[PDB]
């Protein structure tokens, strides 16, 4: 019952940091989980993340210990994985009234509402007198758009291009 | 028990066509459902898809008996519904071996397996000898990255960028 959250793929910088896909709605919902247990070619072996941050859309993750580019290149490949039990198992409303902002820093409008599609969740995406334009968007709920939502600030970050 | 696969947005040429944005995974996937129920301001409505097409990232619909650009205007603002009993209720299995084809024509390679995150399932691509390059890529199995699937034709069309 281990499930995949991330992926380590290469090295970022020289003090022994790696570089990381994540697999996580929001995108930096990964940076949540201190205990990574790491699998490649059924090897596990365990992680502990020390801190970390995007960069575009991928990740660089300190790794408790790993403090040279020498040593993490050899943990180029390793599945991040997680026990199915340690996901939540968000609510619609708590992301209403989010101001949603995009990686230019454009504010695209509030969540007015989301809809239910069959695949992901839809977030209906209304202007208001700060935003960038008129224009009502539909943007859906997954780590490749949404990469940050912070409900105490009530804003939300995400990777759309504002012209589609 | 209506979920939404799509909306209506605007209108595309001058014979009445609409363009839509698609909420299926795979995108193209909306062109499979014939019987559109239309839905705004909770004002229902029934509607028939003749043919469509995607352009880039969203599609255009010819609807019967929408006949030119004027009347197509009305349209704005849809949202293209169904039954929540008329979605599927593929396989893992299905995918493995499809060749993953960008939307410049390169093939990526050839799906290995797919992997259960917590969110969205994503896909392993391994490089073939035919493979654009050496590089094993993770995308996900979402309507903004899988386009179009052919089964028959051991295909599939996606878009994702091939540095990234």
């Known amino acids: 019952d281990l499930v995949v959250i991330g992926k380590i793929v290469s090295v970022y910088g020289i003090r022994g940091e790696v570089k990381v896909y994540s697999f996580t709605d929001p995108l930096d919902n990964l940076l949540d989980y201190r205990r990574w247990t790491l699998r490649r070619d059924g090897e596990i072996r365990q ?3 020390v ?16 403090d040279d580019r020498e040593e993490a290149r050899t943990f180029t490949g390793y599945e991040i994985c997680i026990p199915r039990s ?13 101001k949603v902002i995009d ?6 409008g509030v969540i007015d509402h989301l809809l239910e599609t069959g695949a992901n969740d839809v977030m209906v995406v209304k202007p208001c007198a700060g935003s960038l334009d008129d224009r009502e968007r539909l943007l859906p709920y997954t780590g490749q758009c949404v990469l940050s939502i912070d409900l105490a600030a009530g804003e939300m970050r995400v990777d759309w291009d504002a012209d589609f």
Chains 1, 2 share one sequence.
Do not use: D, N, T
């Not at 801190?51 to 790993?66: I, P, S």
């Open 86 to 98: 340690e996901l939540p198992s968000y609510y619609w409303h708590q992301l209403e009234g989010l």
């Open 51 to 66: 801190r970390g941050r995007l960069h575009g859309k991928v990740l660089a993750a300190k790794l408790k210990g790993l």
């Open 103 to 108: 990686q230019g820093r454009q504010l695209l």
């Open 47 to 49: 992680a502990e993340l």
